[PDB]
Amino acid sequence: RSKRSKLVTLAQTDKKGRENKERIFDEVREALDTYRYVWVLHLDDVRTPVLQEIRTSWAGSKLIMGKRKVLQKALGEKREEEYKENLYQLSKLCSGVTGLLFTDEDVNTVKEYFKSYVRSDYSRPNTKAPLTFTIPEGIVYSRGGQIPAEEDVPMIHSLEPTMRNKFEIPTKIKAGKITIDSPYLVCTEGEKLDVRQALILKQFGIAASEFKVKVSAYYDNDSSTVESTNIN
Amino acid sequence: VEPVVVIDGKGHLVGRLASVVAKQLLNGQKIVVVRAEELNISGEFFRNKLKYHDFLRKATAFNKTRGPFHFRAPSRIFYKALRGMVSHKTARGKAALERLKVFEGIPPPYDKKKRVVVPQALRVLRLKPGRKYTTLGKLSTSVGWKYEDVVAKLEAKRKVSSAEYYAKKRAFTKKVASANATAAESDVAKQLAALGY
Amino acid sequence: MKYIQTEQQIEVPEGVTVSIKSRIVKVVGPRGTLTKNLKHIDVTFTKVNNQLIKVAVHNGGRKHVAALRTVKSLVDNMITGVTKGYKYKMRYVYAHFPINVNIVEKDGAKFIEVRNFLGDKKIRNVPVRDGVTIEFSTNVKDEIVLSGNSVEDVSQNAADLQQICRVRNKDIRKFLDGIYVSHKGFITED
Amino acid sequence: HFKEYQVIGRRLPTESVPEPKLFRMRIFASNEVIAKSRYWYFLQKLHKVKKASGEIVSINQINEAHPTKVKNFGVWVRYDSRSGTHNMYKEIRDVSRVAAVETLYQDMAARHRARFRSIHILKVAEIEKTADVKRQYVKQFLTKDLKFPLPHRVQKSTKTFSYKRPSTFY
Amino acid sequence: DSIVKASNWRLVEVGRVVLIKKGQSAGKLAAIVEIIDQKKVLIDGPKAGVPRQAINLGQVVLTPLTFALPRGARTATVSKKWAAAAVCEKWAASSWAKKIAQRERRAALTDFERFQVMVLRKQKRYTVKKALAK
RNA sequence: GGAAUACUGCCAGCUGGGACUGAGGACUGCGACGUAAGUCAAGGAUGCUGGCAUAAUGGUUAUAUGCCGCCGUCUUGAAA
RNA sequence: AGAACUGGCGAUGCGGGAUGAACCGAACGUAGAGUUAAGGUGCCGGAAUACACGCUCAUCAGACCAAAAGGUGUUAGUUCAUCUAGACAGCCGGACGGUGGCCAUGGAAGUCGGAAUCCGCUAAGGAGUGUGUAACAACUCACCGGCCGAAUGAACUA
RNA sequence: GCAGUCAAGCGGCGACAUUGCUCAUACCGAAGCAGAAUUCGGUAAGCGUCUACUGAU
RNA sequence: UUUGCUCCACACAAUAUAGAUGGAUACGAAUAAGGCGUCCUUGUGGCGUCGCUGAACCAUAGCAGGCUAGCAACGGUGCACUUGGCGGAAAGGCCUUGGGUGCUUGCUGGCGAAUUGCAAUGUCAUUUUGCGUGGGGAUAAAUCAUUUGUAUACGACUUAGA
């Protein structure tokens, strides 16, 4: 007794368990014999609608269904475990998000697509904002004045506690509208975005950051090359 | 072995100390208890304080004067515990109790005389480590004792002038050790070591 | 299971120094010094390499083991206080009656005075503990800042200020006058 | 101090059925007389043969081969209580089986109020290899260079008075 | 700069030498070979003549001396390490061991020997007191 | 490969220290030692002594000490 | 309650049960010596503040049937789930398309309400568990992923 | 009360849910408690509709 | 007051001993830490070492502790004088300068022990009192009575006087 009382809210969904991993484990091995070229992606940050657009942009190319550490075991971390020759060296070169592309498209097609592809994204933590913005020194609005304040809508009172406490800014409620006494500088160029700084920009919807999937290593089922035309 | 044993009640248990002293009293050995205000009782303060009030309730239903009365001094509390362990209302019990003396602090001339302790009644050697305990000083004051400040105030004066006596004694023993040390290894000293002395 | 020995580690930054004996703990550093008494917790200390202090309990039970971690937290708080320092910000907002907060030095105690709280004629005095220093925030609307080395003194003083401003049997929703801890940041944050 | 006895009974033979199965089991008891009684009791609980038709073929004490090596013992015990008998498994670190089983009875009486008559020792087997022990309180003693003090030692005084104000240091 | 007091607690460990308090081996030294549990330990005293056995820590008092010994060392190994460490020679050269001999020596003193102590003690007193007061 | 040691049980083995009893009253008997004469711890204590010759230990009783503890009849299941 | 059978008392002292019909042992001439029955060994109270193993903080504990169940009290186990393909927890990210699913209607966009609760890709995502708005919006879990680094979680027995 | 469904479990029995008729005072916590007044819950049980005693030696 | 009262030295007696038959030998504080010596970095500092019991320390030899001669130290100690200091909690005691007088078993010598007959606690202290001397000191009050009321059921209590 005297233990944390576990809490859970009843929902239709349920945990997948290890059986899901087993299907994941075999999926990578099957792809090595089906597709021609193998690529590993390092998209440390993702957006699901953007991922679907990348996934749906083509049919032959397939993003492997699996988990990073499971991918390593599926690919084989040793010469005695590799499903194909020279694959074990390739597996140990990727870490983090489960980025990996299996496709039959030519290498020139792969590099051209990723190099040209680019999309906007929110200022994620650990990054530096490419711009600076100061909140108006009076009543604040939904967009913070980035768009004309006349067109902007006043911030809803319900979000005041988040700004006052979570973001730590000295906000207060005045007749249902949040007000500040000074033009608080949310962030500036060169500063590494803390979670609070990123959240403030995220709350305002300022997608002042670019996003593109970075790929490092390339592999083939017969050439077995470990060339890495890394693009950042 | 000692005509008059002086026992320091500090750090002792009332039940264990009283029982040990009670048997000696029945054996004809005179005993004196000092520093009773620093005596300790097992259990946290609330239990000891609560139990004392419960006993006070049953003094007498109709008239307290025509019955028992509650003594607030810490020494009397120890005496009450020891009294129940002696065959009172008898010649042997009454005579034995006359051999016992209890005072708060160390009133003279006991201050100038050695005082012993009972190893089988110390809180350190009996109470489990980390367990709470109650001190008679707080308990006695909570039940109406009005001399805790006086005892504490003048006990410091007792503590003072005693280190000075020990300081003189410590210096004197240092001279004795040097005198004994230099006299060591002599013909008489070497022969003494053979016989164990 | 009655752990034979449970140990905890406390990292000591080079900027501070700690001396340990019978359980009176002293911490010395750039911001000052702190003292704490742990004779009632029966833990054993040990200096490893002057950068890590080990606290261990032998034959500690579940009730005793739980107290072992508290020593690290209290010692860690002292280390952080002497290095970083604790700053408790508060704001004395009001609806209609302006809350006036001032400091008086009756008998040299530097008591904090609160006046005109919800129109009450009574003047509320809040004592200031040793070590904690009061500094009114500049250009910040009705903000008061509490700073000090000891968490207990700084935190307790903030609690007393908020507690003594309780509304006497009134609708909490309709009445907002009071003092609240807006932030619990450090003095030299980085 | 119990002793380990091996008891065999063979449901005294009858014509056309010589040399019966000769059921064999090991019983821990303080003396041979107690061991014999427990053997009969256990039989009636498993084998429906009764003491009237039973016989004790032989009984010999089994002394531990090496009463110097410290051995981890895994013990399976079936014990009765207010509720139906429950299967139980415990691990004990002791020099000999007889010593280890003795501690089990003390633990059962303390932590389960069970007694000798209500406890049936199923099997005692040595944990011949390390890292096979499951209980945490037994793995506790397997750490390398295990050093621990004995704080707060108390010396049993002989006389009723002490002038030294003794210290509990060790 | 940081200081932590000694906390020099005696620890039960392999190779620890201990003195038996109670039983047939009272007053005989022994060396802990392997700890059995919290309360029981295995000891060996081949030089002291006490047979190898398991004894509860309550009946044994730990001495401050120690010597290297592998866990589970047999009687032959313990004796070899025991002799090499010369714990017996180190043990005797201590006040704790010396006091035991002094108490035993005082018990065997004959009445004639006891009388000699008085004469010798008084003679030493004269010299000791003569040295003082100067 | 051979020794012990622990445990159990035996000794019609040995050797001390302490406490109570001294009952029977000339031999008859069963036994031991000795070649024998005889002796003995062998069907119940004998051998010396120190003070009491101020002759007491002790007997009855007042008190004290440690412990124990209203009568005659009659009910019912005892007490009542 | 009542029919009957067998035992203790009924005529009965003694020790223990703190006192106690019917409880435990023990069936009595007056004495000296030794061992015990039940009860006990901190004092009253004659006998070990003995040893060994565990167990409990109770704000009248514990020693003296209304209790099935409650308790983030404590201690040892039983049956299952996960686990170096990274067990628990703590932070961060993803948390999607049909779709503002169909109907009442100023409005229910997942979250005032009524029946389904379908589908594609996914790394996993409920026509959505709550917070939240006049309705949006925004936060969160359940569901996965990233940093951490081994045992953890669920129900029961005593 | 009588009758009936179901079942956490106990091993055929069955908890609760289930269907038919038959303070005035004071201090705290919650209440659409805006104020006043107020109910609810706890705490204090405060507060209200020959010999006992006593003089005297 | 036939010198009553009391302090002191002993002279004999008595009353009894909840019970001597070498010494109640003095720091404080902690008990998951402390004692003693040393050092300088005077601090929660470094070094050496002690506990695990007082089985200790002091004292202890002489006719129940005699009569005498020397040696070496000039210390140890009993007793009376005497300087100074400390102790008010129940101090009623605790220590020091000075010299005086005995012992000194620190060391070496010269004599007595007996017949208490083989032991009889073999009488060696404690609190109280009287009678006696010898030497010191001070050498009065209350009640009843008269009277009175701030009192008083009756008692009792409070006023005043040569």
Crossing angle between the packed helical segments B148-159 and B162-183, to the nearest 10 degrees: 30
Q: What angle do CA A94, A98, A102 make, to 5 degrees?
A: 85
State the virtual CA torsion across C153, C157, C158, C159 in degrees, nearest 10.
100
Token representation of residue D50: 């009764």
Token pair 């008239």 in the structure block, residue: B63
- What is the identity of the amino acid at D15? E
> Which residues make Cβ contacts (< 8 Å) with residue D6, sequence separation at least 6?
D24, D25, D26, D27, D58, D59, D60, D62
Are D123 and D76 within 8 A, CB to CB?
yes
Q: Is residue C44 less than 8 Å (CB to CB) from chain E?
A: yes
The CATH number that applies at residue B176 is 1.20.5.4280
Question: B109, B125, B147: which is the final residue of a domain?
Answer: B147
Largest interatomic CA distance in chain C: 62
Tell me, in Å, how far CA of B65 is from C1' of I154?
A: 30
* Angle, CA D152 vertex, CA D146 and CA D158 arms, to 5°: 125
Q: Pairing state of beta strands B30-34 and B100-102? A: parallel
Could you check: is the Cβ of residue B6 within 7 Å of any atom of nucleic acid strand I? yes
What is the C-alpha to C-alpha distance for residues B89 and B154, in angstroms, rounded to an integer?
37
Interhelix angle A18-34/A68-75, rounded to 10 degrees, is: 50
Burial B21-30 (b: 16+ CB within 10 A, else e): bbebbbeebb
Q: How far is CA A72 from CA A64, A68, A77, in A?
A: 12, 6, 6
- B38 and B134 co-located in one domain: yes
Structure tokens at D102: 């003795």
**How far separated are the first and last CA of chain B, in Å rounded?**
24
Q: Which CATH number does D68-144 carry? A: 3.10.20.10
Q: Is C22 on the interface with D (CB under 8 A)?
A: no
Structure token pair of residue E63: 């001495």
Resolution in A: 3.7
DSSP secondary structure, C123-190, as one string: PEEE---TT-EEEEPSSSTTEEEEEES-HHHHHHHHHHHHHTT--SS--TTT---S-EEEE--BSS--
Question: Which CATH topology does C1-85 take?
Answer: Outer Surface Protein A; domain 3 (3.90.930)
User: Tell me, which fold does domain D1-67 have in CATH?
Assistant: Ubiquitin-like (UB roll) (3.10.20)
Instruction: Locate E75 and state its tokens.
Output: 């009687």
B67 min Cα distance to partner chain C (Å): 43
Give residue numbers, 116 to 175 of B, with CB < 7 Å from strand I.
119, 124, 129, 151, 154-155, 157-159, 161-163, 165-166, 169-171, 173-174
Contact D145, E13 (CB under 8 A): yes
Which nucleotide is at minimal CA–C1' distance from B42? G57
Please give the span between the terminal C-alpha atoms of chain A, in angstroms, as a whole number: 53
Choices 3.40.50.620, 2.30.30.30, 3.50.50.60, 3.40.50.720: CATH for E11-93: 2.30.30.30
Q: Which residues of D touch C58 (CB under 8 A)?
A: 148-149, 151
Q: ∠D67-D72-D77 over CA atoms, to 5°?
A: 105
How far is the C-alpha of E59 from the C-alpha of C156, rounded, in Å?
Answer: 51
Residues B93 and B161 in one domain: no
Q: What CA–CA distance (Å, rounded) separates D66 from C157?
A: 68
Residue A79 CA to residue A62 CA, distance in Å, equals 25
Domain ranges of chain D: 1-67, 68-144
Q: Are B121 and B20 in contact (CB under 8 A)?
A: yes
Strand partners, C11: C52
Distance CA C79, CA C74 (A): 9
Residue C20: which H helix or E strand, with range? strand C17-20
Distance in angstroms (rounded) separating the CA atoms of residues A39 and A109: 12
The DSSP symbol for A95 reads: -
Q: Find residues 105-164 of chain D whose CB sits inside 8 Å of chain B.
A: 151-152, 154-155, 157, 160-163
Residues 6+ apart with CB under 8 A from D131: none
Q: Do residues A140 and A179 touch, judged by C-beta distance below 8 A?
A: yes
Q: How far apart are the C-alpha atoms of E47 and E67, rounded to whole Å?
A: 15
At residue A103, the 3 state secondary structure works out as strand
* Final residue in a domain of this structure, among B147, B169, B185: B147
Residue position matching structure tokens 């010994």: E69
Q: CA distances (Å), D130 to each of B66, B96, B165, D14, D139, in order? A: 76, 65, 63, 49, 9
Closest CA to C103 of C67, C132, C61: C132
Instruction: Please work out, in degrees rounded to the nearest 5, the angle formed at the alpha carbon of residue E4 by the alpha carbons of E2 and E10.
Output: 155
Question: Do residue B5 and residue B53 come from a single domain?
Answer: yes
Say how far apart CA B117 and CA B125 lie, in whole Å.
12
How far is the C-alpha of A78 from the C-alpha of A100, rounded, in Å? 19
Mapping DSSP to helix (H, G, I), strand (E, B) and coil, where does residue D14 land?
strand
List, in order, residues 6 or more apart from B8 with CB less than 8 Å away: B34, B35, B115, B116, B117
Phi and psi angles of residue B127, each rounded to the nearest 5 degrees, phi first: -80, 140
Q: How far apart are CA B9 and CA B100, in angstroms?
A: 14
Sign of the C-alpha dihedral computed for residues B161, B163, B168 and B169 taken in this order: positive
Contact status of E4 with chain C (Cβ, < 8 Å): yes
Strand I atom within 7 Å of E39 CB: no
Token match 């700073």: residue?
C147
The encoded tokens of residue B16 equal 């264990």
Question: In this complex, do D94 and E36 lie within 8 Å of one another by their Cβ atoms?
Answer: yes
The three-class DSSP label of residue D38 is helix
* Residue D88 φ/ψ region, left for φ over 0, alpha for ψ in the -120 to 50 degree band, beta for the rest: beta
Euclidean distance between CA atoms B98 and E110, whole angstroms: 44
Same domain for B85 and B136, yes or no, is: yes
Provide the β-strand partners of residue D76. D89, D123
Rg (CA), chain C: 21
The phi, psi pair for B122, rounded to 5°, reads -75, 145
DSSP secondary structure letter of residue C111? E
User: For chain B, what is the domain count?
Assistant: 2
Q: Say which experimental method was used.
A: cryo-EM
Residue B64's domain comprises 1-147
> CB-hemisphere CA count at 13 Å for E78?
27
Instruction: Answer yes or no: are the C-beta atoms of A68 and A97 closer than 8 Å.
Output: yes
Token pair, residue A181, equals 């006494």
Task: Looking at the complex, report in whole angstroms how far the Cα of residue C21 sits from the nearest Cα belonging to chain A.
Answer: 34
Instruction: List where CATH 3.90.930.12 sits in chain C.
Output: 1-85, 86-190
Q: What secondary structure letter does DSSP report for E24?
A: T
Supply the CATH number for residue B16's domain: 3.90.1180.10
Q: What SS3 class is residue A36?
A: coil
Give residue D100's identity as a one-letter amino acid code. Answer: A
The 3-state secondary structure of E54-109 reads EEEHHHEEEEEEECCCCCCCCHHHHHHHHHHHCHHHHHHCCHHHHHHHHHHHHHCC
User: How is domain C86-190 classified at the architecture level of CATH?
Assistant: Alpha-Beta Complex (3.90)
Q: Where are the alpha helices (DSSP H) in D19-135?
A: 32-46, 97-111
Query: How far is the C-alpha of E134 from the C-alpha of E131, rounded, in Å?
Result: 7
DSSP D103-136: HHHHHHHHHT---STTEEEEEEEE--STT----H
3-state DSSP helix/strand/coil percent for chain E, to nearest 5?
Answer: 40, 25, 35
Same domain, B133 and B181: no
Return phi, psi of residue D40, to 5°: -65, -45
Q: How far apart are CA D141 and CA D138, in angstroms?
A: 6
The answer to whether residues B12 and B42 belong to one domain is yes
Contact yes or no for E124 and B188 at CB 8 A = yes
Q: How far is CA C132 from CA C104, C105, C128, C129, in A?
A: 15, 15, 7, 6
From the CA atom positions of chain D, what is the Rg in Å? 22
CA of C171: nearest nucleotide by C1' is H33
CA at A166, C1' at G147: how many angstroms apart?
A: 22
CA C117 to C1' H37, whole Å: 25
Rounded CA gap, B147 and B161, in Å?
22
The reply to whether C119 Cβ lies less than 7 angstroms from strand H is no
Tell me if A168 and C141 make a contact (CB, 8 A cut-off).
Answer: no
